[PDB]
Amino acid sequence: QFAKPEDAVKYRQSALTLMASHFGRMTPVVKGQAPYDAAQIKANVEVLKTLSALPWAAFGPGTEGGDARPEIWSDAASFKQKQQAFQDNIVKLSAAADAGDLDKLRAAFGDVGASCKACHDAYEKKK
Amino acid sequence: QFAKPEDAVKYRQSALTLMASHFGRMTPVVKGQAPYDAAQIKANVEVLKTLSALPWAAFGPGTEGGDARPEIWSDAASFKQKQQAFQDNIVKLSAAADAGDLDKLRAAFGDVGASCKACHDAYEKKK
Ligand code: HEC
Ligand code: HEC
């Protein structure tokens, strides 16, 4: 769907920005600093589910750019494992949210965050 | 979920960028320049549905910035009518996609596009 590599870069950066907001906005809830409303969180995690599937198709071959490391494309299988593992961590978060289980939500949230960082450490260029 | 107005601006711009991609990528399909696969379009319109609900919460009071006109906030009811009308146009597009009805999809696509433009004409600052 991208006319030039720049368009893929802009898409993925936008998708990832939206994920960071839908993930990060739950930090106060998991810390207990904001109240836990199970329905609110269930709905938010459903948005996060949708969003979490979107970036990867915008790293199609030849879409070097942005802060994407070239290793994304030189070992495609490894990158795919990391995004699939991240999405399965999102599945655990969805299960927790759908169950209304705050303890499970906290644990899953932490595992999701670790999975974001694991990918960044391998595949995101440093500042 | 936004620490500063800039964060709301960045969110909404990202959301709208993603909508433009999920909407616009169907242009060749509705024109017949690319093939029509009903399942593919159904899935894409479901993503567009989700995305189409997201920008509006990021125009909360005091989030002037970006290319948002101030009139968004001075007549809140009118802006709300436009976003709600746009989302109902998206409902028509979803119905068409879910039905696998290409004629209905073309018509709905055009009405959606008109609704994007109607809002921009009133509420988006010019270049
Ligand atoms: C887990 C919930 C997250 C969160 C919160 C974020 N990511 Fe990542 N990310 C990856 C790569 C390769 C990039 C660079 C993209 C490019 O510049 O081309 C990024 C970038 C981001 C951003 C910045 C977006 C921007 O505005 O430029 C943000 C906010 C972000 N990420 C948050 C790669 C990955 C992964 C590889 C499989 C995974 C998993 C994640 N990111 C997960 C997350
Ligand atoms: C219908 C499917 C669409 C499409 C394809 C787009 N929009 Fe809009 N839009 C609105 C406002 C107020 C702005 C400015 C936001 C800001 O700068 O603070 C925009 C902006 C955009 C963009 C640019 C995003 C960016 O990267 O900066 C794009 C690509 C975009 N839009 C596409 C307002 C509205 C509406 C008011 C109710 C409606 C409806 C739409 N937009 C619909 C659409």
Side-chain angles (χ1 to χ4, degrees), chain A residues 2 10-11 13-15 17-18 21-22 25 47 50-51 54, chain B residues 2 10-11 13-15 17-18 21-22 25 47 50-51 54:
Chain A
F2 305 122
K10 178 174 168 159
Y11 178 101
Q13 292 178 346
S14 295
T17 291
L18 295 169
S21 178
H22 284 278
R25 70 181 59 196
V47 172
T50 298
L51 294 171
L54 302 182
Chain B
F2 305 122
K10 178 174 168 159
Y11 178 101
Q13 292 178 346
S14 295
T17 291
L18 295 169
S21 178
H22 284 278
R25 70 181 59 196
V47 172
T50 298
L51 294 171
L54 302 182

PDB file of all heavy atoms in Angstrom, chain A residues 1-2 10-11 13-15 17-18 21-22 25 47 50-51 54, chain B residues 1-2 10-11 13-15 17-18 21-22 25 47 50-51 54, unseen atoms left out:
ATOM      1  N   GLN A   1       0.794  -1.192   0.000  1.00  0.00           N
ATOM      2  CA  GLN A   1       0.000   0.000   0.000  1.00  0.00           C
ATOM      3  C   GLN A   1       0.847   1.272   0.000  1.00  0.00           C
ATOM      4  O   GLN A   1       0.283   2.348   0.245  1.00  0.00           O
ATOM      5  CB  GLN A   1      -0.827  -0.123   1.262  1.00  0.00           C
ATOM      6  CG  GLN A   1       0.042  -0.946   2.203  1.00  0.00           C
ATOM      7  CD  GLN A   1       0.916  -1.722   1.283  1.00  0.00           C
ATOM      8  N   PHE A   2       2.157   1.177  -0.191  1.00  0.00           N
ATOM      9  CA  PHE A   2       3.046   2.310  -0.024  1.00  0.00           C
ATOM     10  C   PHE A   2       3.691   2.651  -1.344  1.00  0.00           C
ATOM     11  O   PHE A   2       4.291   1.818  -1.999  1.00  0.00           O
ATOM     12  CB  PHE A   2       4.082   1.929   1.050  1.00  0.00           C
ATOM     13  CG  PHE A   2       3.438   1.499   2.346  1.00  0.00           C
ATOM     14  CD1 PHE A   2       3.674   0.248   2.896  1.00  0.00           C
ATOM     15  CD2 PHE A   2       2.582   2.358   3.020  1.00  0.00           C
ATOM     16  CE1 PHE A   2       3.053  -0.151   4.052  1.00  0.00           C
ATOM     17  CE2 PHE A   2       1.962   1.957   4.210  1.00  0.00           C
ATOM     18  CZ  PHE A   2       2.208   0.703   4.742  1.00  0.00           C
ATOM     19  N   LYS A  10       6.619   6.076   7.413  1.00  0.00           N
ATOM     20  CA  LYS A  10       5.672   6.933   8.089  1.00  0.00           C
ATOM     21  C   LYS A  10       4.534   6.105   8.692  1.00  0.00           C
ATOM     22  O   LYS A  10       4.101   6.368   9.812  1.00  0.00           O
ATOM     23  CB  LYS A  10       5.155   8.002   7.121  1.00  0.00           C
ATOM     24  CG  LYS A  10       4.117   8.940   7.695  1.00  0.00           C
ATOM     25  CD  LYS A  10       3.798  10.056   6.682  1.00  0.00           C
ATOM     26  CE  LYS A  10       2.585  10.915   6.989  1.00  0.00           C
ATOM     27  NZ  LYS A  10       2.721  12.202   6.252  1.00  0.00           N
ATOM     28  N   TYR A  11       4.045   5.117   7.947  1.00  0.00           N
ATOM     29  CA  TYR A  11       2.997   4.256   8.455  1.00  0.00           C
ATOM     30  C   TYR A  11       3.453   3.535   9.710  1.00  0.00           C
ATOM     31  O   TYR A  11       2.734   3.535  10.723  1.00  0.00           O
ATOM     32  CB  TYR A  11       2.562   3.270   7.372  1.00  0.00           C
ATOM     33  CG  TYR A  11       1.505   2.309   7.816  1.00  0.00           C
ATOM     34  CD1 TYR A  11       0.177   2.476   7.484  1.00  0.00           C
ATOM     35  CD2 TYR A  11       1.812   1.209   8.631  1.00  0.00           C
ATOM     36  CE1 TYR A  11      -0.804   1.584   7.886  1.00  0.00           C
ATOM     37  CE2 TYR A  11       0.849   0.327   9.035  1.00  0.00           C
ATOM     38  CZ  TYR A  11      -0.482   0.514   8.686  1.00  0.00           C
ATOM     39  OH  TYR A  11      -1.395  -0.404   9.113  1.00  0.00           O
ATOM     40  N   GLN A  13       5.873   4.086  11.829  1.00  0.00           N
ATOM     41  CA  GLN A  13       6.097   4.993  12.930  1.00  0.00           C
ATOM     42  C   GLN A  13       4.785   5.478  13.565  1.00  0.00           C
ATOM     43  O   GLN A  13       4.671   5.573  14.787  1.00  0.00           O
ATOM     44  CB  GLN A  13       6.979   6.157  12.484  1.00  0.00           C
ATOM     45  CG  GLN A  13       8.392   5.731  12.166  1.00  0.00           C
ATOM     46  CD  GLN A  13       9.268   6.845  11.673  1.00  0.00           C
ATOM     47  OE1 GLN A  13       8.769   7.899  11.316  1.00  0.00           O
ATOM     48  NE2 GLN A  13      10.593   6.624  11.642  1.00  0.00           N
ATOM     49  N   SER A  14       3.794   5.750  12.732  1.00  0.00           N
ATOM     50  CA  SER A  14       2.492   6.136  13.232  1.00  0.00           C
ATOM     51  C   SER A  14       1.830   4.991  14.011  1.00  0.00           C
ATOM     52  O   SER A  14       1.236   5.212  15.061  1.00  0.00           O
ATOM     53  CB  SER A  14       1.578   6.600  12.110  1.00  0.00           C
ATOM     54  OG  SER A  14       2.062   7.775  11.501  1.00  0.00           O
ATOM     55  N   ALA A  15       1.894   3.784  13.452  1.00  0.00           N
ATOM     56  CA  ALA A  15       1.313   2.614  14.126  1.00  0.00           C
ATOM     57  C   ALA A  15       1.958   2.391  15.489  1.00  0.00           C
ATOM     58  O   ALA A  15       1.278   2.117  16.468  1.00  0.00           O
ATOM     59  CB  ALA A  15       1.433   1.392  13.249  1.00  0.00           C
ATOM     60  N   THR A  17       3.613   4.584  17.308  1.00  0.00           N
ATOM     61  CA  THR A  17       3.212   5.696  18.188  1.00  0.00           C
ATOM     62  C   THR A  17       1.861   5.389  18.829  1.00  0.00           C
ATOM     63  O   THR A  17       1.669   5.590  20.042  1.00  0.00           O
ATOM     64  CB  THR A  17       3.169   6.995  17.378  1.00  0.00           C
ATOM     65  OG1 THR A  17       4.478   7.367  17.022  1.00  0.00           O
ATOM     66  CG2 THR A  17       2.569   8.135  18.203  1.00  0.00           C
ATOM     67  N   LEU A  18       0.886   4.944  18.051  1.00  0.00           N
ATOM     68  CA  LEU A  18      -0.417   4.596  18.604  1.00  0.00           C
ATOM     69  C   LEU A  18      -0.338   3.463  19.583  1.00  0.00           C
ATOM     70  O   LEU A  18      -0.989   3.492  20.628  1.00  0.00           O
ATOM     71  CB  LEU A  18      -1.395   4.245  17.510  1.00  0.00           C
ATOM     72  CG  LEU A  18      -1.673   5.437  16.633  1.00  0.00           C
ATOM     73  CD1 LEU A  18      -2.430   4.983  15.415  1.00  0.00           C
ATOM     74  CD2 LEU A  18      -2.398   6.578  17.380  1.00  0.00           C
ATOM     75  N   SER A  21       0.923   4.621  22.879  1.00  0.00           N
ATOM     76  CA  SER A  21      -0.071   5.326  23.671  1.00  0.00           C
ATOM     77  C   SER A  21      -1.082   4.388  24.303  1.00  0.00           C
ATOM     78  O   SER A  21      -1.450   4.550  25.464  1.00  0.00           O
ATOM     79  CB  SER A  21      -0.791   6.345  22.825  1.00  0.00           C
ATOM     80  OG  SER A  21      -1.782   7.001  23.565  1.00  0.00           O
ATOM     81  N   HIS A  22      -1.571   3.389  23.567  1.00  0.00           N
ATOM     82  CA  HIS A  22      -2.548   2.467  24.103  1.00  0.00           C
ATOM     83  C   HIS A  22      -1.947   1.507  25.133  1.00  0.00           C
ATOM     84  O   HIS A  22      -2.657   1.075  26.019  1.00  0.00           O
ATOM     85  CB  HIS A  22      -3.307   1.769  22.993  1.00  0.00           C
ATOM     86  CG  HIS A  22      -4.319   2.659  22.363  1.00  0.00           C
ATOM     87  ND1 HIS A  22      -5.559   2.853  22.908  1.00  0.00           N
ATOM     88  CD2 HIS A  22      -4.233   3.540  21.340  1.00  0.00           C
ATOM     89  CE1 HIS A  22      -6.184   3.794  22.218  1.00  0.00           C
ATOM     90  NE2 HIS A  22      -5.414   4.226  21.256  1.00  0.00           N
ATOM     91  N   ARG A  25      -0.682   4.124  28.348  1.00  0.00           N
ATOM     92  CA  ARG A  25      -1.748   4.792  29.113  1.00  0.00           C
ATOM     93  C   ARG A  25      -2.267   3.872  30.233  1.00  0.00           C
ATOM     94  O   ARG A  25      -2.980   4.361  31.104  1.00  0.00           O
ATOM     95  CB  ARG A  25      -2.882   5.248  28.234  1.00  0.00           C
ATOM     96  CG  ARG A  25      -3.731   4.118  27.657  1.00  0.00           C
ATOM     97  CD  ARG A  25      -4.850   4.589  26.761  1.00  0.00           C
ATOM     98  NE  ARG A  25      -4.354   5.361  25.632  1.00  0.00           N
ATOM     99  CZ  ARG A  25      -5.120   6.128  24.874  1.00  0.00           C
ATOM    100  NH1 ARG A  25      -6.430   6.201  25.094  1.00  0.00           N
ATOM    101  NH2 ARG A  25      -4.598   6.866  23.910  1.00  0.00           N
ATOM    102  N   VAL A  47      -8.302  -2.412  21.396  1.00  0.00           N
ATOM    103  CA  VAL A  47      -7.667  -1.460  20.460  1.00  0.00           C
ATOM    104  C   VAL A  47      -6.184  -1.802  20.296  1.00  0.00           C
ATOM    105  O   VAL A  47      -5.669  -1.867  19.172  1.00  0.00           O
ATOM    106  CB  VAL A  47      -7.863  -0.019  20.934  1.00  0.00           C
ATOM    107  CG1 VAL A  47      -7.028   0.937  20.049  1.00  0.00           C
ATOM    108  CG2 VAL A  47      -9.333   0.367  20.907  1.00  0.00           C
ATOM    109  N   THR A  50      -5.588  -4.785  17.971  1.00  0.00           N
ATOM    110  CA  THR A  50      -5.671  -4.386  16.552  1.00  0.00           C
ATOM    111  C   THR A  50      -4.408  -3.664  16.137  1.00  0.00           C
ATOM    112  O   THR A  50      -3.811  -3.981  15.101  1.00  0.00           O
ATOM    113  CB  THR A  50      -6.894  -3.512  16.319  1.00  0.00           C
ATOM    114  OG1 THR A  50      -8.071  -4.285  16.637  1.00  0.00           O
ATOM    115  CG2 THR A  50      -6.952  -2.966  14.900  1.00  0.00           C
ATOM    116  N   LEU A  51      -3.988  -2.679  16.914  1.00  0.00           N
ATOM    117  CA  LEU A  51      -2.855  -1.874  16.552  1.00  0.00           C
ATOM    118  C   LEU A  51      -1.568  -2.694  16.483  1.00  0.00           C
ATOM    119  O   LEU A  51      -0.703  -2.456  15.619  1.00  0.00           O
ATOM    120  CB  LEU A  51      -2.658  -0.721  17.521  1.00  0.00           C
ATOM    121  CG  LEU A  51      -3.755   0.344  17.522  1.00  0.00           C
ATOM    122  CD1 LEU A  51      -3.522   1.307  18.686  1.00  0.00           C
ATOM    123  CD2 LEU A  51      -3.751   1.110  16.192  1.00  0.00           C
ATOM    124  N   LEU A  54      -0.372  -4.241  13.246  1.00  0.00           N
ATOM    125  CA  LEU A  54      -0.184  -3.391  12.065  1.00  0.00           C
ATOM    126  C   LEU A  54       1.236  -3.057  11.656  1.00  0.00           C
ATOM    127  O   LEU A  54       1.484  -2.934  10.468  1.00  0.00           O
ATOM    128  CB  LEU A  54      -0.989  -2.100  12.213  1.00  0.00           C
ATOM    129  CG  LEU A  54      -2.494  -2.260  12.410  1.00  0.00           C
ATOM    130  CD1 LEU A  54      -3.153  -0.926  12.503  1.00  0.00           C
ATOM    131  CD2 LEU A  54      -3.132  -3.078  11.287  1.00  0.00           C
TER     132      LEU A  54
ATOM    133  N   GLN B   1      -4.932  10.576  28.331  1.00  0.00           N
ATOM    134  CA  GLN B   1      -3.724   9.812  28.237  1.00  0.00           C
ATOM    135  C   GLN B   1      -2.532  10.648  27.773  1.00  0.00           C
ATOM    136  O   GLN B   1      -1.503  10.054  27.422  1.00  0.00           O
ATOM    137  CB  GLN B   1      -4.067   8.724  27.242  1.00  0.00           C
ATOM    138  CG  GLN B   1      -5.121   9.356  26.343  1.00  0.00           C
ATOM    139  CD  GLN B   1      -5.731  10.406  27.202  1.00  0.00           C
ATOM    140  N   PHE B   2      -2.659  11.967  27.695  1.00  0.00           N
ATOM    141  CA  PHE B   2      -1.641  12.807  27.094  1.00  0.00           C
ATOM    142  C   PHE B   2      -1.062  13.731  28.135  1.00  0.00           C
ATOM    143  O   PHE B   2      -1.768  14.454  28.816  1.00  0.00           O
ATOM    144  CB  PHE B   2      -2.303  13.576  25.935  1.00  0.00           C
ATOM    145  CG  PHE B   2      -2.962  12.657  24.936  1.00  0.00           C
ATOM    146  CD1 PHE B   2      -4.314  12.754  24.640  1.00  0.00           C
ATOM    147  CD2 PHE B   2      -2.220  11.680  24.288  1.00  0.00           C
ATOM    148  CE1 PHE B   2      -4.915  11.889  23.761  1.00  0.00           C
ATOM    149  CE2 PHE B   2      -2.831  10.807  23.378  1.00  0.00           C
ATOM    150  CZ  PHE B   2      -4.182  10.919  23.097  1.00  0.00           C
ATOM    151  N   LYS B  10       0.231  14.673  18.418  1.00  0.00           N
ATOM    152  CA  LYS B  10       0.976  13.607  17.788  1.00  0.00           C
ATOM    153  C   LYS B  10       0.105  12.356  17.642  1.00  0.00           C
ATOM    154  O   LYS B  10       0.146  11.688  16.611  1.00  0.00           O
ATOM    155  CB  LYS B  10       2.256  13.327  18.583  1.00  0.00           C
ATOM    156  CG  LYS B  10       3.107  12.196  18.051  1.00  0.00           C
ATOM    157  CD  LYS B  10       4.431  12.118  18.836  1.00  0.00           C
ATOM    158  CE  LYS B  10       5.272  10.875  18.614  1.00  0.00           C
ATOM    159  NZ  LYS B  10       6.677  11.182  19.000  1.00  0.00           N
ATOM    160  N   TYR B  11      -0.671  12.037  18.675  1.00  0.00           N
ATOM    161  CA  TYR B  11      -1.560  10.894  18.608  1.00  0.00           C
ATOM    162  C   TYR B  11      -2.557  11.055  17.476  1.00  0.00           C
ATOM    163  O   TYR B  11      -2.734  10.129  16.666  1.00  0.00           O
ATOM    164  CB  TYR B  11      -2.263  10.703  19.950  1.00  0.00           C
ATOM    165  CG  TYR B  11      -3.235   9.565  19.968  1.00  0.00           C
ATOM    166  CD1 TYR B  11      -2.924   8.345  20.531  1.00  0.00           C
ATOM    167  CD2 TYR B  11      -4.499   9.674  19.371  1.00  0.00           C
ATOM    168  CE1 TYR B  11      -3.824   7.293  20.557  1.00  0.00           C
ATOM    169  CE2 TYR B  11      -5.391   8.639  19.388  1.00  0.00           C
ATOM    170  CZ  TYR B  11      -5.057   7.420  19.964  1.00  0.00           C
ATOM    171  OH  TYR B  11      -5.992   6.427  19.957  1.00  0.00           O
ATOM    172  N   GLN B  13      -2.613  12.949  14.819  1.00  0.00           N
ATOM    173  CA  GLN B  13      -1.978  12.931  13.523  1.00  0.00           C
ATOM    174  C   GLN B  13      -1.566  11.515  13.092  1.00  0.00           C
ATOM    175  O   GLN B  13      -1.729  11.134  11.934  1.00  0.00           O
ATOM    176  CB  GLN B  13      -0.797  13.900  13.500  1.00  0.00           C
ATOM    177  CG  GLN B  13      -1.226  15.345  13.594  1.00  0.00           C
ATOM    178  CD  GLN B  13      -0.084  16.318  13.628  1.00  0.00           C
ATOM    179  OE1 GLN B  13       1.049  15.919  13.840  1.00  0.00           O
ATOM    180  NE2 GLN B  13      -0.369  17.615  13.422  1.00  0.00           N
ATOM    181  N   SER B  14      -1.066  10.736  14.037  1.00  0.00           N
ATOM    182  CA  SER B  14      -0.721   9.358  13.755  1.00  0.00           C
ATOM    183  C   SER B  14      -1.967   8.531  13.410  1.00  0.00           C
ATOM    184  O   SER B  14      -1.943   7.721  12.490  1.00  0.00           O
ATOM    185  CB  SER B  14       0.024   8.721  14.915  1.00  0.00           C
ATOM    186  OG  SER B  14       1.273   9.338  15.131  1.00  0.00           O
ATOM    187  N   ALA B  15      -3.027   8.707  14.196  1.00  0.00           N
ATOM    188  CA  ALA B  15      -4.280   7.981  13.938  1.00  0.00           C
ATOM    189  C   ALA B  15      -4.826   8.306  12.554  1.00  0.00           C
ATOM    190  O   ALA B  15      -5.265   7.423  11.829  1.00  0.00           O
ATOM    191  CB  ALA B  15      -5.290   8.283  15.019  1.00  0.00           C
ATOM    192  N   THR B  17      -3.173   9.535   9.982  1.00  0.00           N
ATOM    193  CA  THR B  17      -2.255   8.958   8.984  1.00  0.00           C
ATOM    194  C   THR B  17      -2.614   7.496   8.732  1.00  0.00           C
ATOM    195  O   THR B  17      -2.667   7.042   7.574  1.00  0.00           O
ATOM    196  CB  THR B  17      -0.812   9.107   9.475  1.00  0.00           C
ATOM    197  OG1 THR B  17      -0.448  10.465   9.451  1.00  0.00           O
ATOM    198  CG2 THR B  17       0.157   8.349   8.566  1.00  0.00           C
ATOM    199  N   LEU B  18      -2.825   6.714   9.780  1.00  0.00           N
ATOM    200  CA  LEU B  18      -3.208   5.318   9.611  1.00  0.00           C
ATOM    201  C   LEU B  18      -4.527   5.168   8.914  1.00  0.00           C
ATOM    202  O   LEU B  18      -4.686   4.302   8.053  1.00  0.00           O
ATOM    203  CB  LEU B  18      -3.260   4.604  10.939  1.00  0.00           C
ATOM    204  CG  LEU B  18      -1.894   4.538  11.568  1.00  0.00           C
ATOM    205  CD1 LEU B  18      -2.032   4.066  12.989  1.00  0.00           C
ATOM    206  CD2 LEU B  18      -0.900   3.674  10.760  1.00  0.00           C
ATOM    207  N   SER B  21      -4.178   5.676   5.252  1.00  0.00           N
ATOM    208  CA  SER B  21      -3.603   4.537   4.555  1.00  0.00           C
ATOM    209  C   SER B  21      -4.595   3.403   4.378  1.00  0.00           C
ATOM    210  O   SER B  21      -4.665   2.789   3.317  1.00  0.00           O
ATOM    211  CB  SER B  21      -2.387   4.032   5.288  1.00  0.00           C
ATOM    212  OG  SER B  21      -1.849   2.907   4.651  1.00  0.00           O
ATOM    213  N   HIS B  22      -5.383   3.081   5.405  1.00  0.00           N
ATOM    214  CA  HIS B  22      -6.341   2.002   5.309  1.00  0.00           C
ATOM    215  C   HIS B  22      -7.533   2.351   4.413  1.00  0.00           C
ATOM    216  O   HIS B  22      -8.103   1.459   3.818  1.00  0.00           O
ATOM    217  CB  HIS B  22      -6.741   1.502   6.682  1.00  0.00           C
ATOM    218  CG  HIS B  22      -5.679   0.663   7.301  1.00  0.00           C
ATOM    219  ND1 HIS B  22      -5.536  -0.665   7.006  1.00  0.00           N
ATOM    220  CD2 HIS B  22      -4.606   0.981   8.060  1.00  0.00           C
ATOM    221  CE1 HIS B  22      -4.435  -1.114   7.588  1.00  0.00           C
ATOM    222  NE2 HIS B  22      -3.851  -0.146   8.241  1.00  0.00           N
ATOM    223  N   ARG B  25      -5.743   2.894   0.504  1.00  0.00           N
ATOM    224  CA  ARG B  25      -5.195   1.691  -0.144  1.00  0.00           C
ATOM    225  C   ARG B  25      -6.302   0.928  -0.893  1.00  0.00           C
ATOM    226  O   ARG B  25      -5.972   0.044  -1.678  1.00  0.00           O
ATOM    227  CB  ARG B  25      -4.496   0.784   0.835  1.00  0.00           C
ATOM    228  CG  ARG B  25      -5.426   0.075   1.816  1.00  0.00           C
ATOM    229  CD  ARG B  25      -4.710  -0.814   2.804  1.00  0.00           C
ATOM    230  NE  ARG B  25      -3.744  -0.073   3.600  1.00  0.00           N
ATOM    231  CZ  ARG B  25      -2.790  -0.646   4.316  1.00  0.00           C
ATOM    232  NH1 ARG B  25      -2.691  -1.971   4.371  1.00  0.00           N
ATOM    233  NH2 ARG B  25      -1.893   0.083   4.956  1.00  0.00           N
ATOM    234  N   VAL B  47     -10.189  -3.049  10.200  1.00  0.00           N
ATOM    235  CA  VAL B  47      -9.096  -2.214  10.743  1.00  0.00           C
ATOM    236  C   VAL B  47      -9.479  -0.735  10.657  1.00  0.00           C
ATOM    237  O   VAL B  47      -9.331   0.016  11.630  1.00  0.00           O
ATOM    238  CB  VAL B  47      -7.782  -2.499  10.014  1.00  0.00           C
ATOM    239  CG1 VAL B  47      -6.707  -1.480  10.466  1.00  0.00           C
ATOM    240  CG2 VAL B  47      -7.315  -3.923  10.270  1.00  0.00           C
ATOM    241  N   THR B  50     -11.923   0.337  13.402  1.00  0.00           N
ATOM    242  CA  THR B  50     -11.225   0.574  14.681  1.00  0.00           C
ATOM    243  C   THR B  50     -10.505   1.903  14.645  1.00  0.00           C
ATOM    244  O   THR B  50     -10.626   2.713  15.573  1.00  0.00           O
ATOM    245  CB  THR B  50     -10.253  -0.560  14.972  1.00  0.00           C
ATOM    246  OG1 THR B  50     -11.008  -1.785  15.093  1.00  0.00           O
ATOM    247  CG2 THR B  50      -9.413  -0.297  16.213  1.00  0.00           C
ATOM    248  N   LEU B  51      -9.735   2.149  13.598  1.00  0.00           N
ATOM    249  CA  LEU B  51      -8.937   3.341  13.520  1.00  0.00           C
ATOM    250  C   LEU B  51      -9.796   4.604  13.492  1.00  0.00           C
ATOM    251  O   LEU B  51      -9.428   5.641  14.076  1.00  0.00           O
ATOM    252  CB  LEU B  51      -8.032   3.328  12.300  1.00  0.00           C
ATOM    253  CG  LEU B  51      -6.931   2.267  12.299  1.00  0.00           C
ATOM    254  CD1 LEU B  51      -6.255   2.244  10.927  1.00  0.00           C
ATOM    255  CD2 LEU B  51      -5.899   2.573  13.393  1.00  0.00           C
ATOM    256  N   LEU B  54     -10.679   6.475  16.657  1.00  0.00           N
ATOM    257  CA  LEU B  54      -9.607   6.928  17.552  1.00  0.00           C
ATOM    258  C   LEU B  54      -9.275   8.406  17.562  1.00  0.00           C
ATOM    259  O   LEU B  54      -8.915   8.912  18.612  1.00  0.00           O
ATOM    260  CB  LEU B  54      -8.334   6.121  17.298  1.00  0.00           C
ATOM    261  CG  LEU B  54      -8.446   4.609  17.469  1.00  0.00           C
ATOM    262  CD1 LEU B  54      -7.127   3.956  17.226  1.00  0.00           C
ATOM    263  CD2 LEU B  54      -8.966   4.228  18.855  1.00  0.00           C
TER     264      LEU B  54
END
